[PDB]
């Protein structure tokens, strides 16, 4: 098969990202995969004359202890051309959506020769016993934003016979994964996904066929979705029958901040109860005019803000906060104070022991949700020190993609998203 010409965005060179250290498990697992991929022509050995590099690490195969090979093509995707030469709004409505790893198809299509040098990565050595063993891809690499677009002409041909016989099944693709939504239940959705697994096999598309693990963690449950039951976490005011002047100060501050999102929130009647200079622990009864204002504020906070629509020309931003006792709250937005979704997570892996294991699970959860609702990956504002995150996050990663993220340190003045 011929090769599609691939170029970079105008005025930008290739990626030059240093390789981070890897454990012995992953180094032994990466050299075993790279040799099998070099004997099969998928990758070819190179040297220091290639001035580009991108980080490579290892994750776990689905429902298995065998190691996988994952490349962090984030900086390369930012520099490759925009492949242009539709997102299903009903995918987020299906009773069930299953994710299928179809990245094996990419290892069959040869890659543009004048582009393979931008795909270089380096394998390190324990204690630097050996210098860097470099390679480059000859085929479409998994996790590269150009692979699904180049293969989009081929996949649409494969799925069209299946989509005809099943015209009520949405199929959306993002990177190496297929998002198959259906309205079936009582085992019917499970059987139809295996029909698609048999269809892809007849065209030569291998998919993970391992039996779902019965021992925790049930990581395979992350690939089984039910978007029709997803809820939003609204701003909630404290519910009390007796208030101290300290409770009302907290309440006024939370309302003053909430007014930046909801314009109809008023404070006058509640702040009128803090006119004197009384002790913080003193109970004050509420006037009939203040209770009416609190009721009208609760009524406003029931429904999300209107007049906020998704803009495909803009990027998505995801902010996450740690609430404690395994609780995490998040908001997705394109413009400030105009959230498209507010959610909450709880009872995640490491809820009793590991904050980093919780945060990585939440980041993958939010990203999977944003892929189903809008077809984009958000840019994350992670509440963690930079060195803490980069030390540990690869040990808990499971997706074939990696979203962009930055780090923040915003102490909680008020607890807005969780009361």
């Amino acid at each position, epitope marked *: 098969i011929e090769t599609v010409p691939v170029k970079l965005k105008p005025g930008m060179d290739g990626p030059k990202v240093k390789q981070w250290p890897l454990t012995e498990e992953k180094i032994k697992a990466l050299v075993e995969i790279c040799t099998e991929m070099e004997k099969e022509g998928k990758i070819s050995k190179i040297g220091p004359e290639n001035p580009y590099n991108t980080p490579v690490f290892a994750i776990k195969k689905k429902d298995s202890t065998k190691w996988r090979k994952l490349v962090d093509f984030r900086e390369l995707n930012k520099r490759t051309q925009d492949f242009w030469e539709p997102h299903p709004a009903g995918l987020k409505k299906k009773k069930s959506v299953t994710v299928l790893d179809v990245g094996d198809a990419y290892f069959s299509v040869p890659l543009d020769e004048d582009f393979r040098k931008y795909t270089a990565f380096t394998i390190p050595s324990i204690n630097n016993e050996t210098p860097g063993i470099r390679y480059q891809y000859n085929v479409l690499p998994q996790g590269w934003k150009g692979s699904p677009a180049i293969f989009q002409s081929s996949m649409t041909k494969i799925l069209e016979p299946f989509k005809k016989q099943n015209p009520d099944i949405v199929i959306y693709q993002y990177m190496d994964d297929l998002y198959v939504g259906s309205d079936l239940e009582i085992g019917q959705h499970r059987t139809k996904i295996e029909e698609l697994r048999q269809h892809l096999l007849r065209w030569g598309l291998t998919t993970p066929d391992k039996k779902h693990q019965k021992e925790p*963690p049930f990581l395979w449950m992350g690939y*089984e979705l039910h978007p029709d039951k997803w809820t939003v976490q609204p701003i909630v005011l404290p519910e009390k029958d007796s208030w101290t002047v300290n409770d009302i100060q907290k309440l006024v501050g939370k309302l003053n901040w909430a007014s930046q999102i909801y314009p109809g929130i008023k404070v006058r009647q509640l702040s009128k109860l803090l006119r004197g200079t009384k002790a913080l622990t003193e109970v004050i009864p509420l006037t009939e005019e203040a209770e009416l204002e609190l009721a009208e504020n609760r009524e406003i906070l029931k429904e999300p803000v209107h007049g906020v629509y998704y803009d495909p020309s803009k990027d998505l931003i995801a902010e996450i906060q740690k609430q404690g006792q395994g609780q995490w709250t998040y908001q997705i937005y394109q413009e400030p104070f105009k959230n498209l979704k507010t959610g909450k997570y709880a*009872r995640m892996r490491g809820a009793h022991t590991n904050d980093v294991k919780q945060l990585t699970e939440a980041v993958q959860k939010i990203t999977t949700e944003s892929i189903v609702i809008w077809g984009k990956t958000p840019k994350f504002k992670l509440p963690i020190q930079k060195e803490t995150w980069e030390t540990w996050w690869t040990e808990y990663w499971q997706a074939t993609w990696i979203p962009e993220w930055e780090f923040v340190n915003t102490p909680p003045l008020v607890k807005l998203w969780y009361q």
Partner: antibody
Framework: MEVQLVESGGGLVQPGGSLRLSCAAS??????????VTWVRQAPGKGLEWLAT???????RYADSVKGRFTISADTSKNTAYLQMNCLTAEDTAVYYC???????????????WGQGTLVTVSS | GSDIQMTQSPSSLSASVGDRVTITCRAS??????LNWYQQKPGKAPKLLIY???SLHSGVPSRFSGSRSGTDFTLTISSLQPEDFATYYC?????????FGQGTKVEIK
């Protein structure tokens, strides 16, 4: 319909005899992905002992106390579960419950909606 | 011999209404946080009380709590009630075969 599990088939059995217990499931289908049934016995006055678990994909998990003797099955047509207990001894005299096993999330899996329990006694 | 062993302590205890009761259950190997607690009142079938170490099952009052310190799991009852006098079993599911604790009986005295 609420979730219900009703065991049946217990009774007195002679040494070296066998017995099949039924667990009729109402309120949920055994064909549902992530759903399984689980058998647990409790000798009179003693504690709970886990026995077997069949899952939605015909996957079976047995205890060492019953390996080679007990066989767990499921008929999705009648939406009931079975436990064929061969080679019974007096150490198998107990009340036998069937419970609903379900992998509900990445982290949650337990036993809920326990049946009333049927009694099995072995002579000696 | 590779089966995981769940050991509860104590095997029985006596408390009056309003007391605070703690029941521990130690696992013979690391089972992460994958533990379920069960309540079995006399003559009745077991009820799922707590799942995944600390999550209360639907319908369970706020006096019940579950915690974990490595392999030392703890079920606590802040204000013992007449409805709470039962036998409590811990159960692991980190690995098959699943195993139960020997049980802790909470009596009145």
């Amino acid at each position: 319909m609420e979730v219900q599990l009703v065991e049946s088939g217990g009774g007195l059995v002679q040494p070296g005899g066998s017995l099949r217990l039924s667990c009729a499931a109402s309120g949920f289908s055994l064909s549902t992905s992530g759903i399984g049934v689980t058998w647990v016995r409790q000798a009179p006055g003693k504690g709970l002992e886990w026995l077997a678990t069949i899952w939605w994909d015909d996957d079976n998990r047995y205890a060492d106390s019953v390996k080679g003797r007990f066989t767990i099955s499921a008929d999705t047509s009648k939406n009931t579960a079975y436990l064929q207990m061969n080679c019974l001894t007096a150490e198998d005299t107990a009340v036998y419950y069937c419970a609903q096993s379900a992998i509900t999330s990445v982290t949650d899996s337990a036993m809920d909606h326990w049946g009333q329990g049927t009694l099995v006694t072995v002579s000696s | 011999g590779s089966d995981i062993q769940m050991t509860q302590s104590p095997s029985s205890l006596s408390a009056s209404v309003g007391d605070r009761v703690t029941i521990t259950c130690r696992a013979s190997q690391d089972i992460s946080s994958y533990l379920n607690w069960y309540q079995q009142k006399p003559g009745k079938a077991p009820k799922l009380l707590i799942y995944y170490t600390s999550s209360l099952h639907s319908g369970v009052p706020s006096r019940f709590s579950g915690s974990r310190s490595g392999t030392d799991f703890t079920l606590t009852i802040s204000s013992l009630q007449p409805e709470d006098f039962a036998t409590y079993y811990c159960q692991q599911y980190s690995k098959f075969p699943w195993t139960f604790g020997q049980g802790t009986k909470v009596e009145i005295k």
